Scaffold this active site. Structure first.
Site, PDB file in Angstrom:
ATOM      1  N   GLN A  40     -10.245 -29.368  26.109  1.00  0.00           N
ATOM      2  CA  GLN A  40      -8.844 -29.015  26.168  1.00  0.00           C
ATOM      3  C   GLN A  40      -8.537 -28.013  24.864  1.00  0.00           C
ATOM      4  O   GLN A  40      -8.150 -27.107  25.480  1.00  0.00           O
ATOM      5  CB  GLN A  40      -8.000 -30.284  26.180  1.00  0.00           C
ATOM      6  CG  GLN A  40      -6.522 -29.952  26.209  1.00  0.00           C
ATOM      7  CD  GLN A  40      -5.527 -30.841  26.668  1.00  0.00           C
ATOM      8  OE1 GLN A  40      -5.977 -32.049  26.726  1.00  0.00           O
ATOM      9  NE2 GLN A  40      -4.626 -30.695  27.000  1.00  0.00           N
ATOM     10  N   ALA A  64     -14.816 -37.520  29.075  1.00  0.00           N
ATOM     11  CA  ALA A  64     -15.464 -38.237  28.135  1.00  0.00           C
ATOM     12  C   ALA A  64     -14.492 -39.402  27.514  1.00  0.00           C
ATOM     13  O   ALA A  64     -15.218 -40.467  26.980  1.00  0.00           O
ATOM     14  CB  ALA A  64     -16.198 -37.352  27.207  1.00  0.00           C
ATOM     15  N   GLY A  68     -12.582 -34.725  19.803  1.00  0.00           N
ATOM     16  CA  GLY A  68     -12.681 -35.123  21.335  1.00  0.00           C
ATOM     17  C   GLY A  68     -14.071 -35.617  21.599  1.00  0.00           C
ATOM     18  O   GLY A  68     -15.237 -35.215  20.834  1.00  0.00           O
ATOM     19  N   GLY A  69     -14.002 -36.359  22.632  1.00  0.00           N
ATOM     20  CA  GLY A  69     -15.290 -36.787  23.136  1.00  0.00           C
ATOM     21  C   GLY A  69     -15.992 -35.695  24.245  1.00  0.00           C
ATOM     22  O   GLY A  69     -17.021 -35.386  23.627  1.00  0.00           O
ATOM     23  N   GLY A  74     -15.362 -32.388  23.833  1.00  0.00           N
ATOM     24  CA  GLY A  74     -15.527 -31.391  22.977  1.00  0.00           C
ATOM     25  C   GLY A  74     -16.949 -31.547  22.155  1.00  0.00           C
ATOM     26  O   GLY A  74     -17.669 -30.874  22.489  1.00  0.00           O
ATOM     27  N   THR A  77      -4.689 -37.912  16.313  1.00  0.00           N
ATOM     28  CA  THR A  77      -4.548 -38.108  17.385  1.00  0.00           C
ATOM     29  C   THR A  77      -5.450 -39.146  18.120  1.00  0.00           C
ATOM     30  O   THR A  77      -5.462 -39.402  19.556  1.00  0.00           O
ATOM     31  CB  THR A  77      -4.073 -36.890  18.615  1.00  0.00           C
ATOM     32  OG1 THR A  77      -5.484 -36.486  18.986  1.00  0.00           O
ATOM     33  CG2 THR A  77      -3.683 -35.819  17.505  1.00  0.00           C
ATOM     34  N   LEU A  91     -22.233  -9.755  14.046  1.00  0.00           N
ATOM     35  CA  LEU A  91     -22.261 -11.079  14.006  1.00  0.00           C
ATOM     36  C   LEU A  91     -23.338 -11.421  13.282  1.00  0.00           C
ATOM     37  O   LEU A  91     -23.125 -12.803  12.351  1.00  0.00           O
ATOM     38  CB  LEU A  91     -22.542 -11.513  15.489  1.00  0.00           C
ATOM     39  CG  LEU A  91     -21.357 -11.253  16.324  1.00  0.00           C
ATOM     40  CD1 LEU A  91     -21.448 -12.339  17.690  1.00  0.00           C
ATOM     41  CD2 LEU A  91     -19.962 -11.095  15.932  1.00  0.00           C
ATOM     42  N   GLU A 142     -24.691 -10.270  10.306  1.00  0.00           N
ATOM     43  CA  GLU A 142     -24.340  -9.956   8.768  1.00  0.00           C
ATOM     44  C   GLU A 142     -23.374 -11.319   8.316  1.00  0.00           C
ATOM     45  O   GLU A 142     -23.444 -11.606   7.229  1.00  0.00           O
ATOM     46  CB  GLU A 142     -23.518  -8.613   8.501  1.00  0.00           C
ATOM     47  CG  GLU A 142     -24.298  -7.617   9.204  1.00  0.00           C
ATOM     48  CD  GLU A 142     -23.882  -6.056   8.833  1.00  0.00           C
ATOM     49  OE1 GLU A 142     -23.099  -6.163   7.660  1.00  0.00           O
ATOM     50  OE2 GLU A 142     -23.966  -5.182   9.263  1.00  0.00           O
TER      51      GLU A 142
HETATM   52  N1  LIG Z   1      -5.161 -26.394  17.480  1.00  0.00           N
HETATM   53  C1  LIG Z   1      -5.175 -26.973  18.746  1.00  0.00           C
HETATM   54  N2  LIG Z   1      -5.790 -28.117  18.736  1.00  0.00           N
HETATM   55  C2  LIG Z   1      -6.096 -28.921  19.938  1.00  0.00           C
HETATM   56  C3  LIG Z   1      -5.561 -28.288  21.231  1.00  0.00           C
HETATM   57  N3  LIG Z   1      -5.654 -29.181  22.041  1.00  0.00           N
HETATM   58  C4  LIG Z   1      -6.316 -30.234  21.501  1.00  0.00           C
HETATM   59  N4  LIG Z   1      -6.593 -29.980  20.090  1.00  0.00           N
HETATM   60  C5  LIG Z   1      -7.242 -31.046  19.389  1.00  0.00           C
HETATM   61  O1  LIG Z   1      -8.112 -31.770  20.230  1.00  0.00           O
HETATM   62  C6  LIG Z   1      -8.249 -33.013  19.473  1.00  0.00           C
HETATM   63  C7  LIG Z   1      -8.293 -34.100  20.677  1.00  0.00           C
HETATM   64  O2  LIG Z   1      -9.463 -34.136  21.199  1.00  0.00           O
HETATM   65  P1  LIG Z   1      -9.708 -32.997  22.480  1.00  0.00           P
HETATM   66  O3  LIG Z   1     -10.477 -31.737  21.892  1.00  0.00           O
HETATM   67  O4  LIG Z   1      -8.460 -32.791  23.235  1.00  0.00           O
HETATM   68  O5  LIG Z   1     -10.784 -33.764  23.249  1.00  0.00           O
HETATM   69  P2  LIG Z   1     -11.194 -33.255  24.646  1.00  0.00           P
HETATM   70  O6  LIG Z   1     -11.712 -31.844  24.625  1.00  0.00           O
HETATM   71  O7  LIG Z   1     -10.111 -33.185  25.617  1.00  0.00           O
HETATM   72  O8  LIG Z   1     -12.508 -34.182  25.356  1.00  0.00           O
HETATM   73  P3  LIG Z   1     -12.225 -35.483  25.909  1.00  0.00           P
HETATM   74  O9  LIG Z   1     -11.432 -36.326  24.903  1.00  0.00           O
HETATM   75  O10 LIG Z   1     -13.480 -36.252  26.243  1.00  0.00           O
HETATM   76  O11 LIG Z   1     -11.338 -35.289  27.197  1.00  0.00           O
HETATM   77  C8  LIG Z   1      -6.841 -33.243  18.808  1.00  0.00           C
HETATM   78  O12 LIG Z   1      -7.153 -34.022  17.628  1.00  0.00           O
HETATM   79  C9  LIG Z   1      -6.431 -31.934  18.721  1.00  0.00           C
HETATM   80  O13 LIG Z   1      -6.282 -31.672  17.243  1.00  0.00           O
HETATM   81  C10 LIG Z   1      -4.758 -27.061  20.992  1.00  0.00           C
HETATM   82  O14 LIG Z   1      -4.283 -26.596  22.031  1.00  0.00           O
HETATM   83  N5  LIG Z   1      -4.526 -26.480  20.090  1.00  0.00           N
HETATM   84 MG   LIG Z   2      -9.720 -34.120  27.971  1.00  0.00          MG
END
Ligand SMILES: Nc1nc2c(ncn2[C@@H]2O[C@H](COP(=O)(O)OP(=O)(O)OP(=O)(O)O)[C@@H](O)[C@H]2O)c(=O)[nH]1
Ligand SMILES: [Mg+2]
Ligand SMILES: CC(=O)O[C@H]1C(=O)[C@@]2(C)[C@H]([C@H](OC(=O)c3ccccc3)[C@]3(O)C[C@H](OC(=O)[C@H](O)[C@@H](NC(=O)c4ccccc4)c4ccccc4)C(C)=C1C3(C)C)[C@]1(OC(C)=O)CO[C@@H]1C[C@@H]2O
Ligand SMILES: CC(=O)O[C@H]1C(=O)[C@@]2(C)[C@H]([C@H](OC(=O)c3ccccc3)[C@]3(O)C[C@H](OC(=O)[C@H](O)[C@@H](NC(=O)c4ccccc4)c4ccccc4)C(C)=C1C3(C)C)[C@]1(OC(C)=O)CO[C@@H]1C[C@@H]2O
Ligand SMILES: Nc1nc2c(ncn2[C@@H]2O[C@H](COP(=O)(O)OP(=O)(O)OP(=O)(O)O)[C@@H](O)[C@H]2O)c(=O)[nH]1
Ligand SMILES: Nc1nc2c(ncn2[C@@H]2O[C@H](COP(=O)(O)OP(=O)(O)O)[C@@H](O)[C@H]2O)c(=O)[nH]1
Ligand SMILES: Nc1nc2c(ncn2[C@@H]2O[C@H](COP(=O)(O)OP(=O)(O)O)[C@@H](O)[C@H]2O)c(=O)[nH]1
Ligand SMILES: [Mg+2]
Lengths: 431, 430, 46, 431, 430
Positions: A11, A91, A135-136, A138, A171, A244, A246
């Site tokens: 996300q 995830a 994130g999972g 991520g 979060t 990139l 450097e």
């Molecule tokens: N700066 C910023 N951080 C974000 C944003 N969206 C999510 N995050 C970060 O992502 C963290 C939550 O995990 P996610 O990256 O959403 O996990 P995911 O990519 O959705 O993967 P899953 O949990 O498996 O669905 C939070 O702690 C946020 O800090 C955004 O739009 N901007």
């Molecule tokens: Mg997600």
């Protein structure tokens, strides 16, 4: 010529990519439908058909809601339908799900798409990866994809823009587990990883932009501005161009230390731009202030290894040299003794562009600042302390174990993290 | 894409299900006849989560109606929103448990469980990507408890990788609606502790307290209680149907709030709750919502969280808001109440934000809490069980269906073990 | 008169002693409040 | 070139600063929005944007009322928004609150702003501080700020404009405590400190200007005229220019005696201007009357140690020399024997400007006089007597003690003030 | 920013609070419905000190309504400016103290204090930077006195650094409205001397005298006296709400007016007060205000300042005037009346000027005096207490609530020590 491939996963990666590509279309004068209304932008946009430019981006997620939002947005007719890849079940903040169980179902398709996109490129220079540690999807999928890319290409540079966990803001409850696991399995497969904190950007928005409701859009716009400033040297021409390679040559002293911090200047509101003249010296000075760094860690607690400065717009080299010298004479900051020269500069003529309806004022010059310093060892120690607190009682472990992770991986990651802290402390001692 | 199968059993289950389906149909712009009459594309983009599409734009809820007596479902069918349900989903017997757990689990349940499973399989075959099951019932009743436990057992044997949510009605502490309530409650927790992914406990006394003291309702009926429960149900799964800044589905909640497999009993809550006249005396902001979340008087179970320590907390927000405000509020709550959270779990709070608010509200928020104070409820129920078991009162009704005292001893031992675990997880040891 | 003063003196000590005893247990756990988040002052390079 | 930074603390400081900045903007023809409608004022104003001038001022207060009044008034667009720093709770006539409890919360921010403003300056030579002795935040935060500035810089000059407590007029009950404490703290950090008395200004407005309703606006306008006459040598060129360092090197013979007295002439009303053809000799004479002094103390009771004369407008050096000679031969006034040459004279071309709506007529010549005399010793002694009267019974002491100040600080301050009285009485004995 | 929480208890407290809130709302241009209909920006610039902004351009006063009987606040709610208050702030019991200090402090106060403190916390945490607390009550009643002291003690424990202000109606010297007012007055002073930052004393007899002699009112009612007291409160807190030429908040007044912690009982006064017919024959100037303020007949307390000597004096001027005239009048007062000011304190007068006129006239001024003559009130109360205490009259009414004679003896001893201190502080010794 030289081309760059951008990958956004999860996300956070997908939304930051939305902001980045909106900025990119704005800066090059490209309408959201892919048609130019009136050419160095071939690094990011490929010419397909009659006057239509298709960005070189891949959007990956195991949950379809955010990509579906992209497919119905203003930029629906911009992305190739096959670059937007979706799964069925996310995830669910579980690293094992995104690494071992769900990730392996679509990793082959993602690799196939990346290969198809890259074979067209003739001067491919590297990959840009946007994700988040906590994130999972991520962390798990970025670890798996980075491992696959390093096995496949190896020689090409790979860069990350990850969201480091904040010391207080959180979060998720299982954040330290995923963070530790992904940094353990990513440490040996990366060249440079720029990290930001949501808390630090919240503070920047409140203190400087005078914004009391900084939604995620503002944070994503700031991160997009940083990425655009980084890639301006590729997309334009300047008195001193930096590609990139450097970045990793000058910011990475040792293979296990590739975690710089990215800041930006000037971050001011519209009303305050009238009362300030935005000179090169003052923005260079502001780039080093602890209150402007976008990672919640104090630079004064450690010593800088290397520093990189990227100037855009109305910039004259003599003043840049004078400002850098003035910074060097200042004792408020510290540098390691084994690095007598710790500055790399880049100057580009193209000034920053302002997204309409945004929050940043129009300026004629701007600075992007990247610093590799030992102050992040404190953050690493804090993460490891949280890991130890949550692991002495085997909390949440069964969730990861049930998806194919052996209990020994947690121990291995903890020992690797301890080794990295030891490296950071050994390199922080003068001779 | 993720889809949810809904099941309801017994009188309490059927009533809460009817109210829940009225709420869901109103949110998605579905008229009682089953034809879409909304005004936004978002109400249709994710309509397959709860409703199937039939020929002619008609939408059929993916729900199953189960009872051992036909009175409650005859009332449901003859009432409003009775034509949306497919008539093939109404499964019933002719006997009724008569507030007997053994009757509904071993004698009457065995005849209907095959038909219920057949309907469940038929519904799940049509599903593209199943997210899990959700079930509404009451622990204190015969058919409700017996059939609910039997159905979770069977489905868990069928689909072990899916997600199970039950919205149970645990017995009240002061006034009891049934004499044999401890027996059924204990025999139901014995199965729930091992067959359910996560469970939300509901108390009628807590609901009466909320209605009388917060909503200023002079004559609260069961309709209002079911309205509140349905609001919480909709708030839990809002992230599967509308886009938002930070999404969170059922599996994410289960990961973030279940540290150990045997501790998956939560206390739900909702905000805002105001009367018809006092709503003009307060602003609509995030900190007031956060105040209402962590109010022991706002909890939907008769357990005081001040007597224990929170393990994990979930806050699901709805509406246009600012993430910084939410994060600072959660930080303030955590630091300022540092004494009410366990020390070995840093960052006890999980946060989700959804863009679409409830129809007619600027913002809303749902609270879910995994607190060790639930051990007091378990201890009270076990105490009543033991007090009624030494004299062997009412035991010949249950032992006349096939059960034996060994089952009762196993159930009491399991409940004592669960209470012991909940108590032991309040130790610092560092 | 002196004995009455001593009785008053004793009463004052007993009062303060139960007051300290009452406040000892009250400060152990705390109370439930919410309030608002108070930002920390920025750090400076000075 | 040479630049100055002006600091205003407390209610009195902020109001006098507003008056002074209105006068400065009027003198140089600068509109309230900061623009110019048609160049030696770079000392006070800094060029920015497209022809916009931002004054080099810092406004500090621990209560928001007066600063918000400034932020809403006509000059809301003249000042930089970050230069107006505000607390939440004021000192409430408590030195300890302004120095120990509340001042420490924003002293770091104030120092950051001061350093940021000074870094922009190439030839910064001194700071101007406006405050009042009686107030809590005024005295306390002034002492703290001067301590920090002396530690940080040390070599730059630090002038003071302070409201000396009136011998009879009073607006507070705890005035002697604050005055003694702040004098003891700042005695070893101030290069020079000019003072005026509200009571004497009232008397001047009543007797000369023929005003019976002199609100603080008239007093602040008079003080602004005096500070304009002082800084005209920096802001304009003349036959004999005087810098800021010259004041301290000519008026301060010992580091513990830096309390001169400021007067001004001519102070006349518009009706009486027509009947008096003002000339150099008679204004020089009028600067020496006890009734024209702006501190309620008789100069005839003591002996002059050093005098500074600043002339503006139509002034001939020969007439100045003749008038000074005539004053010297007059035996009604006295000079210390060890200072045979006790006069410093400066002349500026630019005449004073009249603010519309004011109460002073237009004159082509004006004089600002600053004299270091021993006649302030009786005022010091009176303050000590009041302090002793209030300290024998420990009145209001608990208010200061509860804020962290030790009880020995009062004794130390009293002993220091007694030593100051000894120094003043010893320096006033001819030999 | 700097904000004040207002609390009123008992019949007198509720009545004076209603009048005061009507006064403030008229001053800030807020209609009874709570919607701003003013004509100046300065009315809204500092509205946060007393009001909370709700959704839809509505302002809710930051007030708490406390009583042990429902009649008074039922009358307040049913009357005008009753819909402006938040209904949740109305906190009532069912028994009533019955003019008994013990019953209001130990038997019903203990039950109501938890609820009142919860409401106070909810109001205070929603604040930004709390300035202090303010209480309106009396000393001759049961619930007023008892609950006021209980709340003051509890708040002082909770917030030891804030500002506590009380407006207490001390008993009249000549006519007594209760037979047991000496007991309540002594038992309440025993707590006020320790737990209150500063206290203003007002007598009903002095108010009657002011209305009959100065205002030429034939039939003064309680509304007029509440009007006078409300005017005094607004004058005291006017420097927090409008910009001023020289301004002072509550803490500044406390610092400048309380030389020692145990002497914080002031006598307030207001100027100008004139009849409808006599307004035409007088000119509103600063000397007239000054001569009216320093008048023995004009004091709001039934104590003659000429008997003692002033310790400190505060004059809060309001309107547009010249500070030269104010300072000259203060000098004239100090030099003419040099026999009424203590020698060991120079500059007995503190002056503040608020730019905006009171609502009404062009100029006005509030006078607050800390005179040693107030020891006469305490001495008279002590005489009545000891005259009623040797015979132990009405003592069983108090000792039947758990109190003992030791408490009475301690309170009398403390009050006599305070009287001795006030007396002996009239000695120059220099
Ligand atoms: N700066 C910023 N951080 C974000 C944003 N969206 C999510 N995050 C970060 O992502 C963290 C939550 O995990 P996610 O990256 O959403 O996990 P995911 O990519 O959705 O993967 P899953 O949990 O498996 O669905 C939070 O702690 C946020 O800090 C955004 O739009 N901007
Ligand atoms: Mg997600
Ligand atoms: C002007 C205004 O605010 O009107 C409100 C209202 O007055 C209040 C009191 C409503 C009202 O609710 C109740 O009176 C109530 C009674 C018993 C149990 C629960 C609620 C309202 O009925 C509720 C209703 O809310 C909704 O429509 C929501 O979408 C809600 N849906 C339903 O309640 C509903 C009713 C019938 C059929 C289908 C749905 C919802 C809430 C959460 C999740 C999904 C849906 C509205 C606008 C109001 C009234 C009409 C008075 C409240 O409703 C909620 C839960 O949002 C009570 O708490 C809120 C606060 C509101 O201020
Ligand atoms: C005909 C006329 O213009 O008369 C004036 C008036 O100024 C006089 C007569 C007023 C008037 O007051 C009285 O007659 C009175 C009667 C009993 C008790 C107290 C007052 C007036 O009511 C007072 C009122 O004052 C105000 O403007 C303020 O609003 C006043 N508030 C209220 O009267 C009020 C009443 C109900 C609800 C809300 C506000 C106020 C006064 C002091 C501090 C704050 C506010 C005005 C215009 C007058 C009248 C109407 C006669 C006086 O009022 C005050 C307290 O200043 C009486 O002493 C002054 C002398 C004035 O000359
Ligand atoms: N000449 C002049 N003096 C002023 C003015 N305003 C206030 N003063 C002086 O300031 C004294 C009051 O103390 P303040 O300066 O207001 O105190 P402060 O700086 O606000 O600090 P606090 O005590 O915490 O409020 C008065 O005795 C006046 O002599 C003004 O406008 N002109
Ligand atoms: N909230 C709510 N609770 C109910 C409702 N109907 C029944 N209950 C509860 O269910 C319990 C009775 O169980 P019941 O379902 O009648 O037994 P069963 O029919 O054999 O399953 C009682 O304690 C009630 O409190 C309802 O409509 N709403
Ligand atoms: N029943 C009851 N009477 C009270 C209380 N407080 C004060 N009184 C009585 O009321 C009398 C005057 O109060 P009140 O008329 O309301 O004061 P005012 O109208 O503001 O001047 C006092 O003499 C008390 O005896 C209380 O809390 N309860
Ligand atoms: Mg002040």
């Amino acid at each position: 010529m030289r081309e760059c491939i951008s990958i956004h996963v999860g996300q956070a990666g997908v939304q930051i990519g939305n902001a980045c590509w909106e900025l990119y279309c704005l800066e090059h004068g490209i309408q959201p439908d892919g048609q130019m209304p009136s050419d160095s932008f071939n690094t990011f946009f490929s010419e397909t058909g009659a006057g239509k430019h298709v960005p070189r981006a891949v959007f990956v997620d195991l949950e379809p809601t955010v990509i579906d939002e992209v497919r119905t947005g203003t930029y629906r007719q911009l992305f190739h339908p096959e670059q937007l890849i979706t799964g069925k079940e996310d995830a669910a903040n579980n690293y094992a799900r995104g690494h071992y169980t769900i990730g392996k179902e679509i990793i082959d398709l993602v690799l196939d798409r990346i290969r198809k996109l890259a074979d067209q490129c003739t001067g491919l220079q590297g990959f840009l990866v946007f994700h988040s540690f906590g994130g999972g999807t991520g962390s798990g999928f970025t670890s798996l994809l980075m491992e696959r890319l390093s096995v496949d290409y190896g020689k090409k540079s790979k860069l990350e823009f990850s969201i480091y966990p904040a010391p207080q803001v959180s979060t998720a409850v299982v954040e330290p587990y995923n963070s530790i696991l992904t940094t353990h399995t990513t440490l040996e497969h990366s060249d440079c990883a720029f990290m930001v904190d949501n808390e630090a950007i919240y503070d920047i928005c409140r203190r400087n932009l005078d914004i009391e409701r900084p939604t995620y859009t503002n944070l994503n716009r700031l991160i997009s501005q940083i990425v655009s400033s980084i890639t301006a040297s590729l997309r334009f021409d300047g008195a001193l161009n930096v590609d990139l390679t450097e970045f990793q040559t000058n910011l990475v002293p040792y293979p296990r230390i590739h975690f710089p911090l990215a800041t930006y200047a000037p971050v001011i509101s519209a009303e305050k731009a009238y009362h300030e003249q935005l000179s090169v010296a003052e923005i260079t000075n502001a780039c080093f202030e602890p209150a402007n760094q976008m990672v919640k860690c104090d630079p004064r607690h450690g010593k800088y290894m290397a520093c990189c400065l990227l100037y855009r717009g109305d910039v004259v080299p003599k003043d840049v040299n004078a400002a850098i010298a003035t910074i060097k004479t200042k004792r408020s900051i510290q540098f390691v003794d084994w690095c007598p020269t710790g500055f790399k500069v880049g100057i580009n003529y193209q000034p920053p562009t302002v997204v309409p309806g945004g929050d940043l004022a129009k300026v004629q010059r701007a600075v992007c600042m990247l610093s590799n310093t030992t102050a992040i060892a404190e953050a690493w120690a804090r993460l490891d302390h949280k890991f130890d607190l949550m692991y002495a009682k085997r909390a949440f472990v069964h969730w990861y174990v049930g998806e194919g992770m052996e209990e020994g991986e947690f121990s291995e990651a903890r020992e690797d993290m301890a080794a990295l802290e030891k490296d950071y402390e050994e390199v922080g001692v003068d001779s | 894409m993720r889809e949810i199968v809904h099941i309801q059993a017994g009188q309490c289950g059927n009533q809460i299900g009817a109210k829940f389906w009225e709420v869901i149909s109103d949110e998605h712009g579905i008229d009682p006849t089953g034809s879409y009459h909304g005004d936004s594309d978002l109400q249709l983009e994710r309509i397959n989560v709860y409703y199937n599409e039939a020929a002619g734009n008609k939408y059929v809820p993916r729900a199953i109606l189960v009872d051992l007596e036909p009175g409650t479902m005859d009332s449901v069918r003859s009432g409003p929103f009775g034509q949306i349900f497919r008539p093939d989903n109404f499964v019933f017997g002719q006997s009724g448990a008569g507030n007997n757990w053994a009757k509904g689990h071993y004698t009457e349940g065995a005849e209907l469980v095959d038909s219920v499973l057949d309907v469940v399989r038929k519904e799940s075959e049509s599903c593209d990507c199943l997210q899990g099951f959700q079930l509404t019932h009451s622990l204190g009743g015969g058919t409700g408890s017996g059939m609910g436990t039997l159905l979770i057992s069977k489905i868990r044997e069928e689909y072990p990788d899916r997600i199970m949510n039950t919205f149970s009605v645990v017995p009240s502490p002061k006034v009891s609606d049934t004499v044999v309530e401890p027996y059924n409650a204990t025999l139901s927790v014995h199965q729930l502790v091992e067959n359910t992914d996560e469970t939300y406990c509901i108390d009628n006394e807590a609901l009466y307290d909320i209605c009388f003291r917060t909503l200023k309702l002079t004559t609260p009926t069961y309709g209002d209680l079911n309205h509140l429960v349905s609001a919480t149900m909709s708030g839990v799964t809002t992230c599967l149907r509308f886009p938002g800044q930070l999404n969170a589905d059922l599996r994410k909640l289960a990961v973030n709030m279940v540290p150990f497999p045997r501790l998956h009993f939560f206390m739900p809550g909702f905000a805002p709750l105001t009367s018809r006249g006092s709503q003009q005396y307060r602003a609509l902001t995030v900190p007031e919502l956060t105040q209402q979340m962590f109010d022991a008087k706002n909890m939907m179970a008769a357990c005081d969280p001040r007597h224990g320590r929170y393990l994990t907390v979930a806050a699901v927000f709805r509406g246009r808001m600012s993430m910084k405000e939410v994060d600072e509020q959660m930080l303030n709550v955590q630091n300022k109440n540092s004494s009410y959270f366990v020390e070995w779990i840093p960052n006890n709070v999980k946060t989700a934000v959804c863009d679409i608010p409830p129809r007619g509200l600027k913002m809303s928020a749902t609270f879910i809490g995994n607190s060790t104070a639930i051990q007091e409820l378990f201890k009270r129920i076990s105490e009543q069980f033991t007090a009624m078991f030494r004299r062997k009162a009412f035991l010949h009704w249950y032992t006349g269906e096939g059960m034996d005292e060994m089952e009762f001893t196993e159930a009491e031992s399991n409940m004592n073990d669960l209470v012991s675990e909940y108590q032991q997880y309040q130790d610092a040891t560092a | 008169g002196d004995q009455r003063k001593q009785m008053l003196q004793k009463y004052k000590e007993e009062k303060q002693l139960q007051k300290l005893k009452e406040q000892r247990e009250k400060a152990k756990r705390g109370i439930f409040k919410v309030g608002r988040y108070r930002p920390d002052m920025p750090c400076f390079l000075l």
